[PDB]
Amino acid sequence: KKILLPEPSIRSVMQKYLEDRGEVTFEKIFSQKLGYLLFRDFCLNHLEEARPLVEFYEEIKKYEKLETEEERVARSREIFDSYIMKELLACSHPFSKSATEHVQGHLGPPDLFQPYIEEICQNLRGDVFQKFIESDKFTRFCQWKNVELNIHLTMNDFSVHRIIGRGGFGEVYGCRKADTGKMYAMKCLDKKRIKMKQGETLALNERIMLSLVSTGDCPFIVCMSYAFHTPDKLSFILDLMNGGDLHYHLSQHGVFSEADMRFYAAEIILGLEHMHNRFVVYRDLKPANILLDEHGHVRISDLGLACDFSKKKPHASVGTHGYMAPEVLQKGVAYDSSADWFSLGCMLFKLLRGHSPFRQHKTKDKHEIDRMTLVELPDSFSPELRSLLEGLLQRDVNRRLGCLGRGAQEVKESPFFRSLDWQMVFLQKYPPPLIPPVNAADAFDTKGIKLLDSDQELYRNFPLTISERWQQEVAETVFDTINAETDRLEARKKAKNKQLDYALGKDCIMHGYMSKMGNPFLTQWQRRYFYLFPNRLEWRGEGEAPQSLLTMEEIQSVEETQIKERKCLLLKIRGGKQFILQCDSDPELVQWKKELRDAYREAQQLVQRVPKMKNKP
Amino acid sequence: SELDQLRQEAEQLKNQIRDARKACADATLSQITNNIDPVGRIQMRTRRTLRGHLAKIYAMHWGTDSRLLVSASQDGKLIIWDSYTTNKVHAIPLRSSWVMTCAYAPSGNYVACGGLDNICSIYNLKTREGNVRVSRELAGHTGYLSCCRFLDDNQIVTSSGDTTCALWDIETGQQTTTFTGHTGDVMSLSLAPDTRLFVSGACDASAKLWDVREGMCRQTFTGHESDINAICFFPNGNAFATGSDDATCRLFDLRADQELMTYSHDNIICGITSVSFSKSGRLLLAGYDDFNCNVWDALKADRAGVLAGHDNRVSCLGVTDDGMAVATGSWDSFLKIWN
Amino acid sequence: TASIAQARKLVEQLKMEANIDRIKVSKAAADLMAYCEAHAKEDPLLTPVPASENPFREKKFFS
Ligand SMILES: Fc1ccc([C@@H]2CCNC[C@H]2COc2ccc3n[nH]cc3c2)cc1
Ligand SMILES: [Mg+2]
């Protein structure tokens, strides 16, 4: 159940694993949630040289998050005086002359210390970062990274609760990830229902779109943290929204007022801005696809019909009729974010009148709604609401609100939102109008179907884990508590050796734990500590020197094999013998394969040019 | 051309050396020794079997005490054995896995080793608190270390795959004298008893006699058709034997400046890895690639004995200074004492 | 190969190798055979030795 970290000896394998990918740079470890938490622990408590450099960084970050100048003026005094001015007194400021110039005169905004941020990174990008790598904190980073890169989720990793959503090709459950206790939403799609309706592209596209958006921690979009699949189900691990969709609440509460709709419009706009900044068109904005959380705030969900116009624009008529833009409903017309703004105007119109803007007099047929392609706004609408809707529902894209160059900002500046402070909207400070009290997210609604290997290979690259999402979940739940339990455990292992290293001082390449196979009929897997040398591969037992080894000359091939649905390495020896090794994690399997392949190929090519060592007839 | 002349009279000097040699072949060693009695069947049995090395054994060396011996193995370790008790005196872990040769100082206070690290590492055995620390790392060669032998506790002679030999000063670490001349990877060397001279076999199928103090080469002995992998001095210092990949051992005299005898047989085709004489020089022991050590009548060129006990290539051998026993190291990770 | 000092150093060495004093092979061979007879009395591998003097047969008492 609980997450368990590998032993500190994992550092030898993980460090070479990351170095082969350039992931041991200051820029890449400092910008990770868990890496930052470990780097600051090293700097604050284990290095007086870097302690003032990081305290200055954190005080700046706390200053950037400040809301009002009433607070920015008071805090900027302490930060400048305590950290910048005190050193100039003792004439020991390690920042460029010009860096202080930009901040000095600027007196009587949140981004005033940005020139200093670059200077702080320079003072840490280097020798301070070197001692951190050599420190025990980078070893703890390798312990956590090994867990992240060994994630293989199944249904058993979650405690599934009641159903919170039905529709499409499956249903959605509330669930709890057992190892950290994080509450998520599991969107579980049946593959048989997908293949029956040829909707494989739709399901595959949803994760590709979720992957483009699930970064940055957006509070107005149902983001994704994991994606895995069983032989029969596609599982999306998403943000929990147990308040139902607007399509349901629109029929229970009824039509909304202008001010109650200003709340929903504000949060959807910020959500659309996040997708448009990442070049994603939603194309299916309607009250059914807008969920409520426990408090009443909303998110954009179900990115199945979402498209990516990063390199080439789309032009097909895809979406829900009654909300599609003129540059979309017709065929062969390219478009981009301009479609979502027209969809917003159609959706916002529905929250006020209870029906689609073009579904007049509760018509039922679909072609009765797509006819009106150019707009009669009810008299009860305020003057500012008309100016917003008219801009959002203009037939022309050149005269459309939100399509004039600045994007979502043009919609924020509408006089309908004069009363709003968009910073407070982002912080979810404004009170939601409807707090949900349970069968609140249903939609508008066969066996003997084949599931060949050609179908299972369509979902081949479906498994995915968002690194930013996983590290955040860990950091807020068990990261502090697991490091403490691991520290108390590693200290007992270290203190026990006194009352009780073979790789140091030599030319050892890599060392770690593997499990060679003895008699396979006995499930005999012996965990030995292995030491890789340029010419041999040694392993040892419990508190004993390496009994035997395996020379690089003997190895003919390193191959990957499966034993009882468990990945192992297959070493073929010169005498026709076989040597099987099970690794405890995916990165260990990858690195041991590369390093063993490199070693035996180099060693065999080197012995060839040594008459004392090579083989002769 | 001045270069074409120096090559013309160079080939013209080589014919003078061959003629001077052929002017001395009045008789053969086989004719001289035709009268003396044969040695019979030298029957040696495995007295000790030294176990510990985890991979191939590449080289060995006896101490002057005729009891302690050092060994270098593919397992990146040096082991100093007590041949009488089979107990390990020291298990030195090496800093480079690619070891090829090892040496035991006459005093028994220092040992040396080396290989593809291109460094001769001197280890001090008797330290302050009974440790085995590296006392010096002799760096200077541009190729792998193939052999090394102590003169005393301050000078040592090395051979390398850079086609050179070298004389080192241990305390200062300097490459005192260099011995250039070979055109191929120098494989083995052997010191004369008086230690003013030493011979060296290389992959150019030639062996050279060098003067340690003068730093020059005095005589160059040719004859082998393949790489010379081993070499050892005759006890009286006037001759030396070589072993090569041509499946022959050959004997050369310094005063006659030519080959005297060839130790071969159509029954043997594998190369020779190591050679050594008995205390009196009457026996010539050679380790072969067919997992065997053959005992040769040095005076009559007849095969007199065989040491069968290793399941892989016998990579090195050596006779104690008192001539009591013969050690044999092989690619099967075992050392066996024969007597 | 194309060096003149390389050819000089080769020639002057072949002079040192050619202008030595050589003896007859019969003289050199007799000196070797005479040495083997002079020390055949002192060679344990050439003549059998009892188990007492042999530290490897069946001794086991050492220092
Ligand atoms: F497979 C499904 C299941 C439910 C839905 C509903 C159909 C009605 N409109 C909203 C969507 C999304 O449903 C939810 C419902 C709750 C959620 N929590 N987190 C993501 C959630 C998604 C779509 C596809
Ligand atoms: Mg279109």
PDB file of N, CA and C in Angstrom, chain A residues 451-522:
ATOM      1  N   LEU A 451     -11.683  -8.481 -29.692  1.00  0.00           N
ATOM      2  CA  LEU A 451     -10.617  -7.635 -29.145  1.00  0.00           C
ATOM      3  C   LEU A 451      -9.284  -8.262 -29.556  1.00  0.00           C
ATOM      4  N   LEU A 452      -8.919  -8.082 -30.823  1.00  0.00           N
ATOM      5  CA  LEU A 452      -7.713  -8.677 -31.373  1.00  0.00           C
ATOM      6  C   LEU A 452      -6.470  -7.938 -30.884  1.00  0.00           C
ATOM      7  N   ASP A 453      -5.304  -8.488 -31.232  1.00  0.00           N
ATOM      8  CA  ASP A 453      -4.051  -7.815 -30.907  1.00  0.00           C
ATOM      9  C   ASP A 453      -3.884  -6.532 -31.710  1.00  0.00           C
ATOM     10  N   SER A 454      -4.534  -6.441 -32.874  1.00  0.00           N
ATOM     11  CA  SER A 454      -4.493  -5.205 -33.646  1.00  0.00           C
ATOM     12  C   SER A 454      -5.229  -4.077 -32.935  1.00  0.00           C
ATOM     13  N   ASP A 455      -6.213  -4.413 -32.097  1.00  0.00           N
ATOM     14  CA  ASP A 455      -6.902  -3.399 -31.308  1.00  0.00           C
ATOM     15  C   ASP A 455      -6.082  -2.986 -30.092  1.00  0.00           C
ATOM     16  N   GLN A 456      -5.441  -3.949 -29.426  1.00  0.00           N
ATOM     17  CA  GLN A 456      -4.637  -3.637 -28.250  1.00  0.00           C
ATOM     18  C   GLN A 456      -3.395  -2.824 -28.588  1.00  0.00           C
ATOM     19  N   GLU A 457      -2.934  -2.864 -29.838  1.00  0.00           N
ATOM     20  CA  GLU A 457      -1.783  -2.073 -30.251  1.00  0.00           C
ATOM     21  C   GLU A 457      -2.153  -0.653 -30.656  1.00  0.00           C
ATOM     22  N   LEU A 458      -3.445  -0.357 -30.820  1.00  0.00           N
ATOM     23  CA  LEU A 458      -3.864   1.033 -30.966  1.00  0.00           C
ATOM     24  C   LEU A 458      -3.655   1.800 -29.667  1.00  0.00           C
ATOM     25  N   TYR A 459      -3.940   1.162 -28.534  1.00  0.00           N
ATOM     26  CA  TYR A 459      -3.714   1.739 -27.211  1.00  0.00           C
ATOM     27  C   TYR A 459      -2.328   1.411 -26.676  1.00  0.00           C
ATOM     28  N   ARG A 460      -1.310   1.455 -27.536  1.00  0.00           N
ATOM     29  CA  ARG A 460       0.027   1.017 -27.149  1.00  0.00           C
ATOM     30  C   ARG A 460       0.754   2.082 -26.334  1.00  0.00           C
ATOM     31  N   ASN A 461       0.716   3.334 -26.789  1.00  0.00           N
ATOM     32  CA  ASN A 461       1.352   4.441 -26.090  1.00  0.00           C
ATOM     33  C   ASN A 461       0.382   5.189 -25.183  1.00  0.00           C
ATOM     34  N   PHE A 462      -0.691   4.534 -24.759  1.00  0.00           N
ATOM     35  CA  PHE A 462      -1.686   5.139 -23.881  1.00  0.00           C
ATOM     36  C   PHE A 462      -1.168   5.323 -22.454  1.00  0.00           C
ATOM     37  N   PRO A 463      -0.468   4.355 -21.850  1.00  0.00           N
ATOM     38  CA  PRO A 463       0.043   4.582 -20.490  1.00  0.00           C
ATOM     39  C   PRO A 463       0.918   5.826 -20.417  1.00  0.00           C
ATOM     40  N   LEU A 464       0.625   6.677 -19.437  1.00  0.00           N
ATOM     41  CA  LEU A 464       1.302   7.957 -19.296  1.00  0.00           C
ATOM     42  C   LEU A 464       1.185   8.425 -17.854  1.00  0.00           C
ATOM     43  N   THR A 465       2.200   9.162 -17.404  1.00  0.00           N
ATOM     44  CA  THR A 465       2.215   9.758 -16.072  1.00  0.00           C
ATOM     45  C   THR A 465       2.751  11.177 -16.187  1.00  0.00           C
ATOM     46  N   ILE A 466       1.966  12.154 -15.743  1.00  0.00           N
ATOM     47  CA  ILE A 466       2.406  13.547 -15.752  1.00  0.00           C
ATOM     48  C   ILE A 466       3.348  13.762 -14.574  1.00  0.00           C
ATOM     49  N   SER A 467       4.607  14.094 -14.872  1.00  0.00           N
ATOM     50  CA  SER A 467       5.611  14.202 -13.819  1.00  0.00           C
ATOM     51  C   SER A 467       5.286  15.333 -12.850  1.00  0.00           C
ATOM     52  N   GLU A 468       4.816  16.471 -13.367  1.00  0.00           N
ATOM     53  CA  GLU A 468       4.462  17.581 -12.488  1.00  0.00           C
ATOM     54  C   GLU A 468       3.294  17.214 -11.580  1.00  0.00           C
ATOM     55  N   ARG A 469       2.330  16.450 -12.101  1.00  0.00           N
ATOM     56  CA  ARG A 469       1.168  16.070 -11.302  1.00  0.00           C
ATOM     57  C   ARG A 469       1.545  15.091 -10.197  1.00  0.00           C
ATOM     58  N   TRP A 470       2.425  14.132 -10.497  1.00  0.00           N
ATOM     59  CA  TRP A 470       2.784  13.128  -9.501  1.00  0.00           C
ATOM     60  C   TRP A 470       3.623  13.729  -8.383  1.00  0.00           C
ATOM     61  N   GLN A 471       4.597  14.575  -8.730  1.00  0.00           N
ATOM     62  CA  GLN A 471       5.447  15.178  -7.710  1.00  0.00           C
ATOM     63  C   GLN A 471       4.663  16.122  -6.809  1.00  0.00           C
ATOM     64  N   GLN A 472       3.654  16.806  -7.353  1.00  0.00           N
ATOM     65  CA  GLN A 472       2.819  17.668  -6.523  1.00  0.00           C
ATOM     66  C   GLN A 472       2.008  16.845  -5.531  1.00  0.00           C
ATOM     67  N   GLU A 473       1.371  15.772  -6.010  1.00  0.00           N
ATOM     68  CA  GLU A 473       0.613  14.892  -5.127  1.00  0.00           C
ATOM     69  C   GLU A 473       1.485  14.342  -4.007  1.00  0.00           C
ATOM     70  N   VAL A 474       2.710  13.932  -4.335  1.00  0.00           N
ATOM     71  CA  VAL A 474       3.621  13.419  -3.320  1.00  0.00           C
ATOM     72  C   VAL A 474       4.020  14.522  -2.349  1.00  0.00           C
ATOM     73  N   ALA A 475       4.332  15.711  -2.871  1.00  0.00           N
ATOM     74  CA  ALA A 475       4.865  16.781  -2.033  1.00  0.00           C
ATOM     75  C   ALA A 475       3.866  17.240  -0.981  1.00  0.00           C
ATOM     76  N   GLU A 476       2.574  17.193  -1.292  1.00  0.00           N
ATOM     77  CA  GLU A 476       1.548  17.683  -0.381  1.00  0.00           C
ATOM     78  C   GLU A 476       1.018  16.614   0.565  1.00  0.00           C
ATOM     79  N   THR A 477       1.410  15.350   0.382  1.00  0.00           N
ATOM     80  CA  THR A 477       0.842  14.253   1.164  1.00  0.00           C
ATOM     81  C   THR A 477       1.907  13.524   1.974  1.00  0.00           C
ATOM     82  N   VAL A 478       2.765  12.726   1.341  1.00  0.00           N
ATOM     83  CA  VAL A 478       3.626  11.789   2.054  1.00  0.00           C
ATOM     84  C   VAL A 478       5.102  12.117   1.919  1.00  0.00           C
ATOM     85  N   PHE A 479       5.466  13.136   1.138  1.00  0.00           N
ATOM     86  CA  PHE A 479       6.881  13.406   0.893  1.00  0.00           C
ATOM     87  C   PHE A 479       7.622  13.734   2.183  1.00  0.00           C
ATOM     88  N   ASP A 480       7.027  14.566   3.040  1.00  0.00           N
ATOM     89  CA  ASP A 480       7.684  14.914   4.295  1.00  0.00           C
ATOM     90  C   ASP A 480       7.713  13.729   5.252  1.00  0.00           C
ATOM     91  N   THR A 481       6.637  12.940   5.289  1.00  0.00           N
ATOM     92  CA  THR A 481       6.559  11.840   6.243  1.00  0.00           C
ATOM     93  C   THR A 481       7.378  10.632   5.806  1.00  0.00           C
ATOM     94  N   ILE A 482       7.515  10.405   4.498  1.00  0.00           N
ATOM     95  CA  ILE A 482       8.280   9.256   4.022  1.00  0.00           C
ATOM     96  C   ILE A 482       9.778   9.511   4.142  1.00  0.00           C
ATOM     97  N   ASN A 483      10.214  10.752   3.913  1.00  0.00           N
ATOM     98  CA  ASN A 483      11.621  11.088   4.106  1.00  0.00           C
ATOM     99  C   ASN A 483      12.049  10.890   5.554  1.00  0.00           C
ATOM    100  N   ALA A 484      11.157  11.174   6.507  1.00  0.00           N
ATOM    101  CA  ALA A 484      11.486  10.973   7.914  1.00  0.00           C
ATOM    102  C   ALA A 484      11.614   9.490   8.243  1.00  0.00           C
ATOM    103  N   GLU A 485      10.651   8.682   7.792  1.00  0.00           N
ATOM    104  CA  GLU A 485      10.716   7.243   8.030  1.00  0.00           C
ATOM    105  C   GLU A 485      11.924   6.626   7.337  1.00  0.00           C
ATOM    106  N   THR A 486      12.270   7.129   6.151  1.00  0.00           N
ATOM    107  CA  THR A 486      13.445   6.619   5.450  1.00  0.00           C
ATOM    108  C   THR A 486      14.729   7.030   6.160  1.00  0.00           C
ATOM    109  N   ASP A 487      14.773   8.256   6.689  1.00  0.00           N
ATOM    110  CA  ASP A 487      15.958   8.710   7.410  1.00  0.00           C
ATOM    111  C   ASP A 487      16.191   7.887   8.670  1.00  0.00           C
ATOM    112  N   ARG A 488      15.127   7.608   9.429  1.00  0.00           N
ATOM    113  CA  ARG A 488      15.273   6.777  10.618  1.00  0.00           C
ATOM    114  C   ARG A 488      15.674   5.352  10.260  1.00  0.00           C
ATOM    115  N   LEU A 489      15.291   4.879   9.072  1.00  0.00           N
ATOM    116  CA  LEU A 489      15.659   3.531   8.653  1.00  0.00           C
ATOM    117  C   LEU A 489      17.094   3.474   8.139  1.00  0.00           C
ATOM    118  N   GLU A 490      17.500   4.456   7.328  1.00  0.00           N
ATOM    119  CA  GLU A 490      18.864   4.474   6.809  1.00  0.00           C
ATOM    120  C   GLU A 490      19.886   4.704   7.915  1.00  0.00           C
ATOM    121  N   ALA A 491      19.518   5.455   8.956  1.00  0.00           N
ATOM    122  CA  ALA A 491      20.437   5.677  10.067  1.00  0.00           C
ATOM    123  C   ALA A 491      20.653   4.407  10.878  1.00  0.00           C
ATOM    124  N   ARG A 492      19.642   3.539  10.952  1.00  0.00           N
ATOM    125  CA  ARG A 492      19.810   2.271  11.654  1.00  0.00           C
ATOM    126  C   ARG A 492      20.665   1.305  10.845  1.00  0.00           C
ATOM    127  N   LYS A 493      20.505   1.303   9.519  1.00  0.00           N
ATOM    128  CA  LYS A 493      21.370   0.487   8.673  1.00  0.00           C
ATOM    129  C   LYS A 493      22.820   0.941   8.774  1.00  0.00           C
ATOM    130  N   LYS A 494      23.045   2.255   8.851  1.00  0.00           N
ATOM    131  CA  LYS A 494      24.402   2.785   8.917  1.00  0.00           C
ATOM    132  C   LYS A 494      25.021   2.577  10.295  1.00  0.00           C
ATOM    133  N   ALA A 495      24.237   2.773  11.358  1.00  0.00           N
ATOM    134  CA  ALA A 495      24.739   2.552  12.709  1.00  0.00           C
ATOM    135  C   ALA A 495      24.954   1.076  13.010  1.00  0.00           C
ATOM    136  N   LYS A 496      24.253   0.186  12.305  1.00  0.00           N
ATOM    137  CA  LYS A 496      24.406  -1.241  12.564  1.00  0.00           C
ATOM    138  C   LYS A 496      25.707  -1.781  11.985  1.00  0.00           C
ATOM    139  N   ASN A 497      26.243  -1.128  10.951  1.00  0.00           N
ATOM    140  CA  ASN A 497      27.478  -1.601  10.333  1.00  0.00           C
ATOM    141  C   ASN A 497      28.677  -1.433  11.259  1.00  0.00           C
ATOM    142  N   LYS A 498      28.654  -0.423  12.132  1.00  0.00           N
ATOM    143  CA  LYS A 498      29.732  -0.257  13.102  1.00  0.00           C
ATOM    144  C   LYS A 498      29.815  -1.460  14.033  1.00  0.00           C
ATOM    145  N   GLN A 499      28.673  -1.889  14.565  1.00  0.00           N
ATOM    146  CA  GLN A 499      28.610  -3.079  15.400  1.00  0.00           C
ATOM    147  C   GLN A 499      28.605  -4.367  14.587  1.00  0.00           C
ATOM    148  N   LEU A 500      28.603  -4.272  13.260  1.00  0.00           N
ATOM    149  CA  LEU A 500      28.675  -5.444  12.395  1.00  0.00           C
ATOM    150  C   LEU A 500      30.118  -5.712  11.982  1.00  0.00           C
ATOM    151  N   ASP A 501      33.325   0.160   1.677  1.00  0.00           N
ATOM    152  CA  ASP A 501      32.585  -0.153   0.462  1.00  0.00           C
ATOM    153  C   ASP A 501      33.505  -0.802  -0.569  1.00  0.00           C
ATOM    154  N   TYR A 502      33.041  -1.910  -1.151  1.00  0.00           N
ATOM    155  CA  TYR A 502      33.871  -2.702  -2.051  1.00  0.00           C
ATOM    156  C   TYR A 502      34.140  -2.002  -3.377  1.00  0.00           C
ATOM    157  N   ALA A 503      33.339  -1.001  -3.740  1.00  0.00           N
ATOM    158  CA  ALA A 503      33.457  -0.359  -5.043  1.00  0.00           C
ATOM    159  C   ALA A 503      34.371   0.859  -5.044  1.00  0.00           C
ATOM    160  N   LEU A 504      34.704   1.404  -3.878  1.00  0.00           N
ATOM    161  CA  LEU A 504      35.501   2.619  -3.818  1.00  0.00           C
ATOM    162  C   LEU A 504      36.985   2.317  -3.994  1.00  0.00           C
ATOM    163  N   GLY A 505      37.697   3.276  -4.584  1.00  0.00           N
ATOM    164  CA  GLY A 505      39.123   3.159  -4.793  1.00  0.00           C
ATOM    165  C   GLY A 505      39.537   2.337  -5.991  1.00  0.00           C
ATOM    166  N   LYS A 506      38.595   1.727  -6.698  1.00  0.00           N
ATOM    167  CA  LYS A 506      38.888   0.914  -7.869  1.00  0.00           C
ATOM    168  C   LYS A 506      38.276   1.573  -9.104  1.00  0.00           C
ATOM    169  N   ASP A 507      38.221   0.814 -10.195  1.00  0.00           N
ATOM    170  CA  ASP A 507      37.657   1.282 -11.459  1.00  0.00           C
ATOM    171  C   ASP A 507      36.244   0.757 -11.680  1.00  0.00           C
ATOM    172  N   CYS A 508      35.435   0.702 -10.624  1.00  0.00           N
ATOM    173  CA  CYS A 508      34.089   0.155 -10.732  1.00  0.00           C
ATOM    174  C   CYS A 508      33.196   1.076 -11.559  1.00  0.00           C
ATOM    175  N   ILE A 509      32.447   0.483 -12.489  1.00  0.00           N
ATOM    176  CA  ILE A 509      31.539   1.252 -13.337  1.00  0.00           C
ATOM    177  C   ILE A 509      30.240   1.548 -12.600  1.00  0.00           C
ATOM    178  N   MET A 510      29.536   0.498 -12.187  1.00  0.00           N
ATOM    179  CA  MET A 510      28.213   0.632 -11.598  1.00  0.00           C
ATOM    180  C   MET A 510      27.982  -0.536 -10.652  1.00  0.00           C
ATOM    181  N   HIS A 511      27.230  -0.281  -9.583  1.00  0.00           N
ATOM    182  CA  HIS A 511      26.966  -1.306  -8.585  1.00  0.00           C
ATOM    183  C   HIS A 511      25.560  -1.133  -8.031  1.00  0.00           C
ATOM    184  N   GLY A 512      24.928  -2.254  -7.706  1.00  0.00           N
ATOM    185  CA  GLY A 512      23.575  -2.206  -7.193  1.00  0.00           C
ATOM    186  C   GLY A 512      23.037  -3.597  -6.949  1.00  0.00           C
ATOM    187  N   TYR A 513      21.743  -3.650  -6.652  1.00  0.00           N
ATOM    188  CA  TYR A 513      21.062  -4.891  -6.312  1.00  0.00           C
ATOM    189  C   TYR A 513      20.372  -5.467  -7.538  1.00  0.00           C
ATOM    190  N   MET A 514      20.613  -6.750  -7.793  1.00  0.00           N
ATOM    191  CA  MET A 514      19.866  -7.522  -8.772  1.00  0.00           C
ATOM    192  C   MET A 514      19.569  -8.883  -8.158  1.00  0.00           C
ATOM    193  N   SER A 515      18.835  -9.712  -8.893  1.00  0.00           N
ATOM    194  CA  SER A 515      18.436 -11.034  -8.414  1.00  0.00           C
ATOM    195  C   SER A 515      18.705 -12.052  -9.517  1.00  0.00           C
ATOM    196  N   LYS A 516      19.829 -12.757  -9.418  1.00  0.00           N
ATOM    197  CA  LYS A 516      20.112 -13.817 -10.373  1.00  0.00           C
ATOM    198  C   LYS A 516      19.236 -15.033 -10.080  1.00  0.00           C
ATOM    199  N   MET A 517      19.063 -15.869 -11.095  1.00  0.00           N
ATOM    200  CA  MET A 517      18.169 -17.013 -11.016  1.00  0.00           C
ATOM    201  C   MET A 517      18.968 -18.287 -10.775  1.00  0.00           C
ATOM    202  N   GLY A 518      18.594 -19.027  -9.735  1.00  0.00           N
ATOM    203  CA  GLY A 518      19.179 -20.328  -9.481  1.00  0.00           C
ATOM    204  C   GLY A 518      18.385 -21.423 -10.161  1.00  0.00           C
ATOM    205  N   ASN A 519      17.906 -22.389  -9.391  1.00  0.00           N
ATOM    206  CA  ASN A 519      17.013 -23.403  -9.937  1.00  0.00           C
ATOM    207  C   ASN A 519      15.662 -22.764 -10.228  1.00  0.00           C
ATOM    208  N   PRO A 520      15.238 -22.677 -11.491  1.00  0.00           N
ATOM    209  CA  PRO A 520      13.954 -22.021 -11.776  1.00  0.00           C
ATOM    210  C   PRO A 520      12.756 -22.797 -11.264  1.00  0.00           C
ATOM    211  N   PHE A 521      12.865 -24.121 -11.132  1.00  0.00           N
ATOM    212  CA  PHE A 521      11.756 -24.927 -10.632  1.00  0.00           C
ATOM    213  C   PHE A 521      11.472 -24.693  -9.155  1.00  0.00           C
ATOM    214  N   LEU A 522      12.347 -23.978  -8.449  1.00  0.00           N
ATOM    215  CA  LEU A 522      12.185 -23.706  -7.028  1.00  0.00           C
ATOM    216  C   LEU A 522      11.842 -22.247  -6.749  1.00  0.00           C
TER     217      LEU A 522
END
